[model samples]
Every structure is written in structure tokens, then in C-alpha cells.
Target chain A: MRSFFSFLGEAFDGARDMWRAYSDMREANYIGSDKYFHARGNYDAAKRGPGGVWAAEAISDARENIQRFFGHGAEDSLADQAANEWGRSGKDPNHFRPAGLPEKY
Target chain B: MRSFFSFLGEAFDGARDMWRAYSDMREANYIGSDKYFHARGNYDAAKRGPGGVWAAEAISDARENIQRFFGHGAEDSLADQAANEWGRSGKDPNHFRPAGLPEKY
Candidate 1:
């Protein structure tokens, strides 16, 4: 069980790392950094910058790792299912939202 | 193993969701919103905003969950151990940093 949690922590750490990087990008952008400056300038700015592009790519990578690290194959539908269940649980809707992306996007 | 992965996904989802919310708050504050505005004005702004407060509280809560959801008790030292191992892996230092927090904090 200890080794299991250790492995689990490693996997969780991977997902968490991606989440943190995305969050940091969002913060830097929000704070008006040059990197995030252009996106802040336009309504569709997220489509143009490295931060946005990186965010998208990072998120996809992280989600894929989440599936893989846990030994779930490509078809594992639990993430979506868990999101729905988490949403239904009425704890914090924010708690179910995926990392590094907008809720609706 | 499938159920184990399912539960693992559920746990990962919990941690992921917390990371997402914290990231959102970070983004919102970064964007010069009134909520994060005051902090932007100050050097130590993070300690003052709801976003900051919530972020600190949320992060602590999330880390605790990471330990518990995996059936690791309070004494489970794996999170710290894994963090050290992750740092040594040198893939991305950002990869090992705890969620919802600055690297050094």
C-alpha cells in the first residue's frame, strides 16, 4: 500500500505539475506580462499566444498521462464520468472542472 | 485493476479539479480584476485577496486529500518523498511543485 501510494503520488504529481504550469501561465497573463499581453489585448487572444497554445497542448498531455499512469487504456471514460459525478455531487462545481482550460471550451 | 484505476481516476480527478480552480482564481486575479486588483498593487498581494486566502486554504485542503484519497494516512510520507524523487527526475522542475502554490512557498 505504501508503494502504491508512492506510485499514485508520482502520477498525481505529473497531473498536478501540468495543472500548476497552466495556472502559472494564467496568472502571468492576468498580471499583464509581455507573454500574455497580446491575448489580454483581444477577445480571441487565447488562440494566438504560446501560453494559450501551450496550455492546450499541456492540458491534453496531462489528461493523457492521467489515463496512462493509472494503467487505464485510451478508451477509459472515467474522467468524463467522474467529472459528471463530481458536478452532480454539488460540492464545488469548480472541483470538477478540468485543469488548464476554460470550463466550456 | 479496472476498478482500481477507476478509483485512481476519481482521486486524480479530485486533485485535478482543485488544481483547475486554483488556476482559475490565479488567472482571474492576474487579469486586473477588482478581486485581484489590490494584490497587483502591492508587493505581498497574495496574502490579502480572497483569491489568495482561498488559494492557500484550497491548496492545503487539496494536498491533504491527495494523501487521504489514496488511502495514505496522515503519516504517509510519500507525498514529500515523491516530491524529492520528482525533483531528481529533472524532467521539469515545475512538474514536482505542489499544486495551487508558488514553488518556494
Candidate 2:
């Protein structure tokens, strides 16, 4: 019973969550924050329901593939995916959050 | 008269060319080489006919959008797009190629 408009709304919300996570990651630029941001982005999006989950999966998979396409390490790629799925599955992104980071994130 | 198979062939060829340019970029890791790869990828793809052009446009646009999404500078993104379009329009990618780089590219 999901309407197209509702799905579109979820999609935009998911995208916004992704942008917020990416911005926070850049602003923080803390050591070991990459995985946290990855998880946070997915967590925020996946919480929006099916459309959000769809967007998270789509964006996450494409981002990972592109990173590997650019010669990034396979191990790191797999590790990132783990964090991504962890958040999408509703686990706390704080698990990947680095120590000594600011509370704003 | 373009068959689906033929288009798929061009698509694969275009993707391979993009990978080559990306690999060369990473290997060189030279300063100011980003624009060169951008143009090179588009140039190589655009030369492969319609499917290649499609792939080039698709990849370039997505990459640009993703970069901006991550807070990259708009000026650099526009410059990259200029280079991308230049190559796609059949201009020489060597125009953006920096000096002192290996001829292997």
C-alpha cells in the first residue's frame, strides 16, 4: 500500500541523512571515524522504512563499488560494508564511533 | 541498427577504459592529475560510440554528484565537468595532461 509519493519522501529523507553523515564525517575528520560515519548514514536511512532501506542499500553498494573501482583496498571495502550493514540492521552506529570524538555527531 | 549486444560491448569497453584511467591516476598519484583522468576517461569512453558515451556520461555525472555530496568544492567539480565534456566532445585529453608524467598513460 505504499504510495509513490511516500516512497519519494523516504528517498529524500534517506538522501538527507546520508548528506548529514558525510558532512559530519568531513567536519570531524577524526581518526577512525570513517566506519562510524558509514554506519551512521545507513542507520539514519534504514530507520525510515523500506524506501529508506532501499536508498541506503543502493547508495552504500554503489559507493563501495566505486571505492574499489578507484583502487581502494578490498579489506577496507569489506570492513566498510560490515559497518554499513550493521547500522542498516538497526545496530548502534556508536559501536564504530571512535573515542575522543565530539558529542555533536 | 544498433543491437543490444553491440551496445553492451561498447559499455564494457567504456568501463574498462575508465578503470585504466583510474588505475593510472592512483599509480601516478601526482598532483593535479585529477582533471587528466577525468578527461581521459571521458575521451576513451566517448570514442567507443553511443554505449560508451552513455557510460561515460553516467559515470561522470554520478562521480561529480557524489563528490559534491561529500562537500567537495563546486569550482573543482565544475572544472572536472569541463574536462569531462571536453573529452566527450572529442577534444584531446592531453590538453589536461600534466607535464613530467609517465608516457605509459
Candidate 3:
């Protein structure tokens, strides 16, 4: 479990960092409504920011890994009927400020 | 098993879509290297792109869910010692043309 948590932590950081980079780039040139301006701005963010591969790509990879770990239903063993198959719940943790195994955090 | 595969497929799609949005945004404003310029670009990306919550936070949250499902060890029957618990291998499917759960692709 500890190992799994560790994996989650890594996945979380990767996703958050990727998003942060992406967000930073997007907001920089959102002012101009012109098509050329938008396209040019986006092209630049790709070259300058954290790079999509780190934030966007890494996060997706981690999510898939977790889904595989859970399997599904009774046949898989990991999924439980009682908890939305362990997808999410009201008690979902809040932000840690510093960050966490969650970009949400 | 079939359900498990289906779940994997969803995770794959979500990750891919998120990454695609993030990448699209980042690539837009990646030109200038100055700290202020970089920060401005990123701010725009966050504001304009798919938004960090959809990509970064979602991925992290999903990973944590999977880790919890797996429990800590044997109690988490979903996790198997074999196949690196089915994490990856040569058989790992490639891109799906348009996109997938794999931001990497």
C-alpha cells in the first residue's frame, strides 16, 4: 500500500507540474482575440513552458496505471461496490497548499 | 476482466484529452524566456486552456483512487505480483490515432 501511495504521489506531482506550466502559458497571451495572435501565443507556450509532455502527458499515464491497478467489479477484486468502485466520495481530501498526490490539492 | 479493460479505456481517454488541451495551450505561448514573460504566458494558458483542474487535478485524484483500491498488499487483491501488477510491457498498446488515455502517445 505504501508503495502504491508513493506511486500516486509521484503521479500527482507530475500532473500538477504539467498543468501549472500549461496554465502559465495559456494565461500569458489570452488577451488578443485575433486568430493569428492566439495561434502564435499557443505555439510559444509549447516551446517555453514546462512542455506539455511533463504536465499533460505524465498525468494521463498515471491515471491509466491506477485504473489498471483497480481492475473492475468482483472479477478484478480491487473494485468494491460499496464505494462508487472507489472512484470518489464526499470525504475526498482537500488541498495541501504545498501540493500533493493531487493536482487538486 | 472486461469491465477492468473498459475502465482502463476511460482512464486512457480522460488522460489523453486533458493532455491534448494542455499541450495545445502550452504550445501557443512558448517563445520568450524571460521570467516575467514566462509567467505571463503561463497565466494566460491557465486562463484560456482546458484549465488545470480538468487535466492536472483530475489525473492526481484518479491515481490516489487506484492506490486506495489496491489497499497496502495482499489485502488489496486487485494488485498482483505478476506482470509488475500489469503496469506495462511490450504489449502496451500504442496510440489510437486521434488520441487515448496516454498523453505520452
Candidate 4:
């Protein structure tokens, strides 16, 4: 079995990947483009292996839960989570990508 | 105490207003701009008074419910509802407007 620190390191990397995805999406500022970013973030993290997948799932759940507490809609949150899972499952993030988004994304 | 037909008339008008808002928002195609549309739709509907308010709430609730059935997020839907309520409360829809969005919105 892997040690705790090793798992922690992986999770941290996963978080870093998630952050990178978020920053890129925000800078892109392409409205209606969150699903693609969500997929990409999870995809990038999951590619790191178990720890990354765990971290991505945890973060996605937490974000959705927090949003719900603030009176956000279940339908929208679920859709985002769907995209998150889609990426985590090794699916292409491009499925949700908008046609005119910058190539850098 | 009003007749059913009269209430229906007001509700129809309210629905029309909501449709107008939806159409305008879609044409604008401004991402991250749904909250503004939600508020504008409800605001326009609520201005019609009781029947309008009823219609706005009914439509919003129905929409969210439908989306949830399709696996959408509760949090995002709730946020939209909040915007809808804000407009129904007669608050300015511009409160949710994004910078650079057309003034016609």
C-alpha cells in the first residue's frame, strides 16, 4: 500500500491541475464554457491516478454542496458534476467545448 | 375573486414577457449572463401584477423541476430561482448584468 504522504502529494498535484484549469477558463472568459473546463480539470487530474481522482471528486462535490447551501440550483450543479465525472472517466473534454473558444483552452 | 379567464389573460401576457427575455438573452449569447435573463424575465412578468407573479413563479419552478429530472444541479437552479424572485420582487434586473452586455438587454 502507498504511504499517506505519497497520496497527499498526488492530491496536491491534482489540486494544482484543477487550479490551472480554473485559471485558464477564467482568463478565457468564454461564457457558457464551464462544462469544458470542468471536464478538462478533472481529466487532467484523473490522469495523475487515484489521488488525483479522489481530490477532483472531493473538490467537485464540495463546490456543488457549497453552492446548494447558497440557494443554487440542483439541476445546474448536477450538470457540472456530470462534466466532472465525464472527464474523470477519461472521456474527451472537447465534448462540451464551444465552437469558438480560444485554441489555448 | 376574479374570473379564471381574466387571470389567464394576465398569465399569458406574463409568459410572453418571459419569452421575450429568453429570446433576447439567447440572441445576446452572452455567457455567464443567465442570471440577468432570469431577473429580467421575472421582472417583466411581475410588472403585470398578480397573475404575472403567479405565472413567473410557476414557470420558474417548472423549469427547474424539469432540469432536475434531467440531472441538472440544484444549486445552479436555486440561484436562478433567486434571480427570478428578485425580478418578481420588482428589483432592477441590471443588478445581475455583466459588463459589456448590450444596453438593449
Candidate 5:
């Protein structure tokens, strides 16, 4: 019973924290440079730079690395599968600009 | 007289409230766990030694990418910009004049 009450308290604390984090991140314009935003889609346009296939795999790679670096939960790999569809899907208005020639056309 | 003075005091209060909000937003940008700044010393130390002209070019490349990655327009592009100028000016010259004659000669 004591443990159950402790778990409830932690849940309430986490809920409050997540709410504030959400508000703060929304104003930062989704450009998450920190661990929490990366756990979402690798923000601050990090979510936009890599394109479809690259974004999917690259985010998964970093999430596990960052999560382990912080020693959090263990569902990075399992969660990615349920989240991004292998980046086989594409996003419109993709702002990534690849380097090319001097446009000497 | 009382209403006029009360209205004037409320105007000052409103302006002070606005000032508080601006300071809070600015502070939020500077503070937090994910804070960072341009390590000018680190950059200055990097582009040195017996390294050839490519060292300057490489440093320039690094700073350019860093500026793009960081969202806080607080990025100092000037140092790297000046560094690249020197790098560009040197990439052409090869070795020294043999004994006395210029290499071009």
C-alpha cells in the first residue's frame, strides 16, 4: 500500500512535469535540441533535415543513444517501430537542402 | 483626483508587468539545462599549429555547420567568417619561394 501511494505520487509529479515540458517546447517551435524533444522527432528542424528514410533511422539511432546516455526506459527500438513507419513515408514541404554544384547551368 | 492618480499608478504597474515578462522570456532563453554558447577559445585553438591551409578550411566548414544547427541567432558568425577569409587567401599559395625567387617565377 505504501509503494502504491508512492507510485501514485510519482505519476502526478511526472504528469505536471510533462505538461510544462509540452508548453515550453511548443513555443521553442519544435526545434528540440535536448533529449526530451529528440525522443519525439529530433526537433528544432532536426526532424526535418534528414528526409524520410534518413529521419526515421537516424532518429531511432539517436534516441537509443540519448536514452542510454540518460539511463531511462528500454522501449526505444520497440517504440520506433510503432512510431515512424521506417521513413518509407514522406513529408511534404520538406525543407532539407542538399549541397550541389555551383549551378553553372 | 483619486481616480486620476489611481489610473496613472495602474499604467506604471502594467508597464512593469510587461518588463517582467520580457525579462522572463530572455532569461528562459539563456538558462535551462540545455544551455550552450560559442566556445570561441575552442575554435581559436582548433585552427592552429603546423596544419596546412586545409586546417583553416576545415574549421570554417565546422563553424558554418554549427551556426546552422544552433537556433539562437546568438551564434557568432564573425569569428569563423574572418577565419575563412584568411583560409581562402592562403589555399592558393603553395610552399615557399625556393631560396629567394617567388614560386610563381
Candidate 6:
């Protein structure tokens, strides 16, 4: 039988990569474009002001939630695993951000 | 035993929610703020130009990769589950983006 918790943890690992990719996009100054601009706008609207505190809070909450679900250290391992899975056809790990690149663009 | 595929499907559900939230933030005009600007920058740099076609391609690829991994319709059900999981407590689903809100901000 599949332990939902374990399964969730693994799934979260992959999700972490996706989130990290978005985070990378945001840090890279690409949010104003058509692909990301709308998302950036929504985040701004949701937060409303003050450096988009609400948005930060939401993201922070998500990070913690991901850590808790995976039962692992709040680090990049989960994201690394996800990136590997993202290209399951034996692509080089260096092709993408392993364990998710830092948010410093 | 966990089918790995099923577990991955469930995990992807949670990851999907996180992705949607990030997408929402970008759509809401929040990506330029300190919290998200860096990520936006990275995304931009990675894409380089042409309305960030590379970035869009990456996102689209990620989306397809997610669908392929989960073996489900590319819809919001996965995101809904992740959002629910994000707030494991009995909070109302309406509080957050159920299956992720549309990107039209």
C-alpha cells in the first residue's frame, strides 16, 4: 500500500522544482513579459501593498508546507530530484537548476 | 507497495498548487516587488528576448512534463488537492485559489 505521506513527499519534491523554476524566473527580472507579467500582476493585487507582504507570506507558507510534507530539511534536495525527474530521458542534471538555483537573480 | 506513478500523481497535485500560486502572483503585478523581482529577473535573463519565448517554452514544457508524469487531464484538480494540502487544517477551499485562479489579472 502507498503511504499517502511518503507519496506526497516525493510528489512535493517534483513540485519544488517547478516552484523553484518560477522563483528563478521572478528573480531573473522576467515577470513583466506577457508570459509572466499577468502572474506578477496577480501577486501584486493579492498582496495589495507594502512590498506585497501577503504574497511573501503566501510563498513562505508554501515553502514551510513543502518542507513539512517532505519530512526533509528545507533545502534543495527535493528540487534537485524533481529536476532530474522533469527530464526523465537521461538528460544531464546540469541542464537545469539542480536542487533549485538560489533566488538571487 | 507504492506504484510510484500514483504517488507521483498525488505529489504533482500539491506541486501544481504551488505553481499556480506563483503564476497568480506574476499575473497580479506583484513580480516587480522585492519579494518577486529577483525571480522575475532570472526568468527574463534566461529567456533573453523575443517576449521571452524561451521562458514560455520552459513553462509549457514544464506543464506538459507535469501532465505526462501524473497521467491525468491537464486541469486544476491537482492544484486543488495541493492547495488543500497546503492548509491541512479545515480551512475553506475558497480562501485560496481552488485549482488555481485564471491568469487573467
Per-candidate TM-scores read 0.20, 0.48, 0.20, 0.46, 0.22, 0.20
Model 6: residue B62 alpha-carbon error in angstroms: 18
Q: What is the interface RMSD of candidate 5, in Å?
A: 27.7
- How many times do residue backbones clash in model 1? 3
| Steric collisions counted per model | 3, 0, 37, 19, 5, 43
Q: Candidate 2: deviation at residue B33, Å? A: 1.3
User: Per-prediction DockQ, in order?
Assistant: 0.02, 0.01, 0.02, 0.01, 0.01, 0.02
For model 6, the local distance difference test gives 0.38
Candidate 2 displacement at residue A73 in angstroms: 59
Task: Tell how far residue A44 is off in model 4, in angstroms.
Answer: 0.7
Least accurate 10 contiguous residues by lDDT in model 3 chain A: A80-89
Of models 4 and 6, which has the larger TM-score? Answer: 4
Best by lDDT: 2
What is candidate 6's CA lDDT for residue A14?
Answer: 39
Whole-model Cα lDDT per candidate? 0.37, 0.84, 0.33, 0.82, 0.35, 0.38
Give the poorly placed runs of model 5, Cα more than 4 Å off. Answer: A1-40, A43-63, A78-105, B1-96, B100-105
- Which of 1 and 6 is ahead in TM-score? 6
The alpha-carbon lDDT assigned to residue B23 of candidate 4 equals 80
* Model 5 collision count: 5
Tens-digit lDDT string for candidate 1 (A1-105): 243344445544533444553455456453323222122222121223333332333344444567578886554444433432332222343332235444332
Model 6 residue A102 lDDT score: 38
What TM-score does model 1 score on chain A?
0.30
Task: Give the per-residue lDDT of model 4 (tens digit) for B1-105.
Answer: 123433554565677777778789779999989999999999998997687898788888876888799998879888988999999999999999999998888
- After superposition, which runs of candidate 4 have C-alpha atoms over 4 Å from their true positions? A1-4, A69-71, B1-105
Ranking of all predicted structures according to lDDT, beginning with the best and ending with the worst: 2, 4, 6, 1, 5, 3
Instruction: Score residue A73 of candidate 4 by CA lDDT.
Output: 86
Q: How well is each residue in B25-83 modelled by candidate 6, as lDDT tens digits?
A: 66565422312322332233233332232232334345445656787454543553344
Candidate 1 chain B, poorest ten consecutive residues by summed lDDT = B36-45
